[PDB]
């Protein structure tokens, strides 16, 4: 039947439109089960039926696009090419017969997507009929057909695989003429949206931006026209242009900047439009600030634009009671100001805003004084280096606004003070502790105005948070006595009515003071502990949920500061509070508030208790695992489906290309990260104590190495890998291999794919640390082959990026601030080279000589770092990599000496102390582990090392570690290869270079050799008649510089046995001691008592 299934289709379509959920959750299910192969000629006919309801045709056309955007490989293939080429030409007819521009836009969204899936097969599009449709429609003198063609080209820009060779210059013709179509303004607006979509699609193509530069003047005119007609469709296009491809705007940047300034400045347009115009400029200050820095004339005019939006405040009747949680011009301008001060810098921005803030602070408008203090708070981050100098003047002036006749201004002043305490730390704390603490305490007390009193407490938390413990301790008795007073009075008020806004902040403020005060808080423990314990038993209501969590945080931070001993007095009564509040927080299953407060409070109890925490592990691990495993809700919607989910606010969407989009529920993403970081804490603190949880935590963490939604989670997952192996170690190597098996492949894939550099460096360090955990036999041949390719690629990229950054310099818009970014990029690339050297070090240390054939693939790249014209960090790290080959892969290391030995010998004399140290080290391990093949080179190296050691300034803070390493290398030459040196002659000089105390490893080595020399059958080192024995007392006296580790090392006992044996020779002992300074004399006593 053909006529029977068409009449019943209209009622089913309207059924899934009724306002009640009864038939709504019954008519949608019947629709989906229908075969998709038949849904084509059934649903397109409901749009063609123009005599049917206009709201049913809106739904039929929206439903037809979704079946093409989501499903395609099951519906279109294997269907007859009679009905294949019939849905192509019938869809084209609907657009020609459409009178309503609403439906014309819905059916054009179906013309594209169909065009998109056919074209996206191989490259060449299987629908040349869709292409002819646009050239003939844009050329047809019909406005509707012209508009339909521009909509298909906006939706799917680039319906061609061979556009470049010929159809490219005709696209310019089409849009240039459409932007000149004065007779109609919507056709001009549609081609501006198309021009932008086309330029965005053709990203990276710098030859195409240069060719289409001629479209930017007409494009800017199209935003200037559309905006005054309530259309922020073309303005969004420009913001997208400035964000993704700002260099396209370079030819007419002044015109772009002037227009964006005009739209924003024009009071007449709506808030959404003016804010978007500001956003063009703000985005350019992040994306292309080097270009924007040249148009100072425009950035100067933008400053009062943001300031005028910041003074667009509503006089909220009953502000002092309610809670303010942000779309307004006052928030938009303020945020834009922060972002632009950060983007362009304080050198250019502070001079432009300085006099404007003084005109707003010194004004009777209140809205102006409030805007002034919020502008001061905003510019702080980006201009703080330039704001110091006037800082004492700024602070003393801002402190007067706390006594302002307007409570909202007293609140913005609180914000200014609190934000400066963060932006200018710790200089702020050292300079204004007396004035700021005193003024904030007074605002927290003599206000009788909840919001201002709460904000002053919040500013005080910011102040104490970044305050050095050093200068907080004198203010303890005063601040503590004042905080206790406010806590006890605001606790009575919680009981009278239910006011808690200030009390929440007082509690957190106490916690901040306690945490910073550490051990110095114990004399004030009894003054708050029973008051806070009383609060967590009181605050059980859903209104007080935050007040209870903040009190638990305060309680756990107080016990953590005083330490396990002082806390043991009220520990039992307080651990039961947490046990009871865990079942109270869990019996009302939710997410977001008390979760992170509880997780962190239990973890603080584990640091306090240590090995006694074990009993609480099943009660804390269960809930911790649940929030650490939250799978966030991800959606793959299309078109403008970010309007119905805008009310959520936390549901963030990243608009992907080709109309599709990606959405993610940000709820609990920070809770997941907190929990993952907590699991890392439990693993580290407990070690052996965590074995029961190691397998399930390992199973949880491995997939989180690929959790690209939150960097903090990935870092926690990466950090936990060696720590979990460290825990599991207690069960033996068979369980260790079972754990390492889950990790290995995933850790290696992560290194090869990781986007972020700092997250990559944790994964790379983590992988190296796991290799150390049980090296040799810990790697598959597939893994070695994969790792080889990954490290070789990472090395290839290191040098490639060196050339790229050079090409970034030698660009029209190159300045000192772009050089600062290139140097940051270089610093990151170097830190990745250190982690390449780290992964390499652990493979060498564990596999030894065996792995040199594998390493030959990286050999040309490692040699490439040790080249003479490379930057010093390359030569430093390449030498470090060869030092691990000499130390861990000798004597086979010598086959490869033609790659490192001669440059390493030469480099001992390098201008860079980091290079000198790496070279000196290699020569020391050459004598110790190298073997007989290096013997001639040990005889040769000696005067090179002694020339560095003996030169002046060898012991500068800059060159100590290099000189010490040279001293220790000379030492290793003496001890391990004494046929290559006349040890009997260099020993007096060697002795004079002692002691070592900066390089702790080399201090151990040198001292261990000195002990062999003193303990030897015929010392030589003592001097005839023990003449230089008192000098050995001065060397051993350091000592003072923590060189020889008092208990830990065997040489510590050895050195004290060599010294205490002297005590039995009266005159010799007193001679050696009488010529030691009283500081040195105590260092000998200190050693003798502990070794």
């Amino acid at each position: 039947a053909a006529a029977a299934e068409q009449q019943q289709f209209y009622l089913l379509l309207g059924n899934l439109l009724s306002p009640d959920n009864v038939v709504r959750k019954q008519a949608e299910e019947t629709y989906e089960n229908i075969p998709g192969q038949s849904k084509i000629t059934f649903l397109l006919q409901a749009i063609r039926n123009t005599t049917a309801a206009e709201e049913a045709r809106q739904m039929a056309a929206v439903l037809l696009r979704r079946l093409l955007s989501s499903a395609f490989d099951e519906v279109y293939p294997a269907l007859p090419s009679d009905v294949q080429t019939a849905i192509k030409s019938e869809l084209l007819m609907i657009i020609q017969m459409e009178t309503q521009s609403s439906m014309r836009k819905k059916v054009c969204d179906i013309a594209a997507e169909l065009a998109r899936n056919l074209i996206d097969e191989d490259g060449n599009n299987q629908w040349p009929e869709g292409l002819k449709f646009l050239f003939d429609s844009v050329s047809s003198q019909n406005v509707g057909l012209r508009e339909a063609a521009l909509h298909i080209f906006w939706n799917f820009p680039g319906i061609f695989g061979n556009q470049q060779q010929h159809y490219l210059d005709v696209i310019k013709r089409m849009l240039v003429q459409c932007m000149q179509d004065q007779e109609h303004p919507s056709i001009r607006t549609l081609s501006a949206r198309a021009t932008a979509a086309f330029i965005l699609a053709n990203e990276h193509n710098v030859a195409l931006f240069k060719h289409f530069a001629d479209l930017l003047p007409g494009f800017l005119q199209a935003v200037n026209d559309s905006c005054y007609q309530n259309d922020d469709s073309v303005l969004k296009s420009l913001v997208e242009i400035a964000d993704t491809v700002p260099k396209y705007l370079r030819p007419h940047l002044e015109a772009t900047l002037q227009l964006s300034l005009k739209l924003c400045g024009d009071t007449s347009l709506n808030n959404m439009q003016r804010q978007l115009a500001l956003e063009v400029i703000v985005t350019l200050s992040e994306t292309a600030a080097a270009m924007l820095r040249k148009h100072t004339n425009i950035v100067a005019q933008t400053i009062p634009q943001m300031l005028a939006m910041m003074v667009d405040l509503e006089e909220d009747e009953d502000w002092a009671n309610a809670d303010e949680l942000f779309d307004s011009n006052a928030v938009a301008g303020e945020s834009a100001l922060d972002r632009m001060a950060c983007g362009l810098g304080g050198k250019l921005v502070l001079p432009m805003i300085k006099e404007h803030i003084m005109q707003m602070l010194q004004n009777p408008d209140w809205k102006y004084r409030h805007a002034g203090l919020m502008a001061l708070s905003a510019i702080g981050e980006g201009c703080h280096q330039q704001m110091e100098g006037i800082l004492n003047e700024i602070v003393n002036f801002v402190l007067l606004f706390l006594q302002d006749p307007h409570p909202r201004v007293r609140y913005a002043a609180c914000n200014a003070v609190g934000q400066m305490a963060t932006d200018f730390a710790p200089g702020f704390q050292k300079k204004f502790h007396e004035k700021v603490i005193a003024a904030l305490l007074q605002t927290m007390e003599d206000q009788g105005n909840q919001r201002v009193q709460a904000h002053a407490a919040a500013a005080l938390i910011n102040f104490t948070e970044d305050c050095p413990k050093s200068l907080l301790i004198p203010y303890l008795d005063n601040l503590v006595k004042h905080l206790h007073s406010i806590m006890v009075l605001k606790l009575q008020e919680l009981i009278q009515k239910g006011t808690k806004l200030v009390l929440e902040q007082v509690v957190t403020s106490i916690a901040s003071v306690a945490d910073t005060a550490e051990e110095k808080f114990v004399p004030y423990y009894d003054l708050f502990m029973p008051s806070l314990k009383h609060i967590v038993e009181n605050a059980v209501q859903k209104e007080l949920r935050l007040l209870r969590g903040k009190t638990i945080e305060c309680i756990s931070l107080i016990g953590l500061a005083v330490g396990k001993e002082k806390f043991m007095q009220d520990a039992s009564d307080v651990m039961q509070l947490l046990l009871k509040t865990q079942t109270d927080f869990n019996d009302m299953e939710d997410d977001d508030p008390q979760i992170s407060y509880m997780i962190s409070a239990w973890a603080r109890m584990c640091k306090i208790l240590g090995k006694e925490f074990q009993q609480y592990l099943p009660v804390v691990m269960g809930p911790l695992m649940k929030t650490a495993s939250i799978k966030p809700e991800v959606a793959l919607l299309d078109t403008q489906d970010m309007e119905n989910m805008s009310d959520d606010d936390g549901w963030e969407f990243v608009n992907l290309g080709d109309q599709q989009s990606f959405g993610i529920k940000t709820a609990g993403l920070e809770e997941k990260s907190t929990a993952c970081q907590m699991l890392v804490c439990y693993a580290k603190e407990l070690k052996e104590g965590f074995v029961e949880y190691t397998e399930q935590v390992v199973k949880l963490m491995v997939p989180l190495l690929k959790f690209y939604f939150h960097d903090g989670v990935r870092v926690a997952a990466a950090e936990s890998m060696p720590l979990l192996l460290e825990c599991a170690r207690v069960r033996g190597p068979e369980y260790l291999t079972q754990m390492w098996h889950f990790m290995c492949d995933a850790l290696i894939k992560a290194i090869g794919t990781e986007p972020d550099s700092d997250v990559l460096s944790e994964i790379m360090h983590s992988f190296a640390k796991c290799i150390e955990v049980m090296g040799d036999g810990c790697l598959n041949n597939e893994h070695f082959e994969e790792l080889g390719g990954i490290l070789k690629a990472k090395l290839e990229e290191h040098f490639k990026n060196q050339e790229l950054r050079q090409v970034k310099r030698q660009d029209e818009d190159y300045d000192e601030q772009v050089e600062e970014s290139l140097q940051d990029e270089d610093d990151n690339d170097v830190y990745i080279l250190t982690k390449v050297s780290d992964i390499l070090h652990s493979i060498f240390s564990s596999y030894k000589e065996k792995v040199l054939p594998w390493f030959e693939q990286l050999l040309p790249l490692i040699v490439n770092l040790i080249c003479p014209h490379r930057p010093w960090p390359d030569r430093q790290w390449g030498l470090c990599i060869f030092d691990d080959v000499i130390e861990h892969c000798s004597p086979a290391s010598f086959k490869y000496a033609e790659y490192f030995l001669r440059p390493m010998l030469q480099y001992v004399c390098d201008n860079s102390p980091e290079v000198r140290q790496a070279a000196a080290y290699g020569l020391g391990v050459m004598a110790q582990y190298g073997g007989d093949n290096y013997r001639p080179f040990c005889t040769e190296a000696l005067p090179l090392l002694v020339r560095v050691i003996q030169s002046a300034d060898s012991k500068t803070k800059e060159n100590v570690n290099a000189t010490e390493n040279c001293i220790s290398a000379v030492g290793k030459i003496m001890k391990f290869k004494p046929d290559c040196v006349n040890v009997e002659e260099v020993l007096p000089h060697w002795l004079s270079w002692l002691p070592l105390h900066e390089d702790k490893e080399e201090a151990v080595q040198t001292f261990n050799y000195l002990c062999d020399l003193i303990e030897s059958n015929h010392p030589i080192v003592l001097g005839p008649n023990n003449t230089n024995l008192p000098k050995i007392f001065s060397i051993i006296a350091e000592g003072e510089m923590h060189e020889a580790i008092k208990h830990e090392d065997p040489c510590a006992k050895r050195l004290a046995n060599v010294v205490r044996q002297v005590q039995t020779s009266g005159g010799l002992w007193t001679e050696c001691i009488a010529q030691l300074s009283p500081e040195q004399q105590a260092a000998i006593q200190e050693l003798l008592n502990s070794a």
Binding site: T834, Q876, L879, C880, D883, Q917, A918, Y921
Partner: peptide, 4 residues
């Protein structure tokens, strides 16, 4: 961190 320091190094060589």
């Amino acid at each position: 961190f320091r190094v060589r």
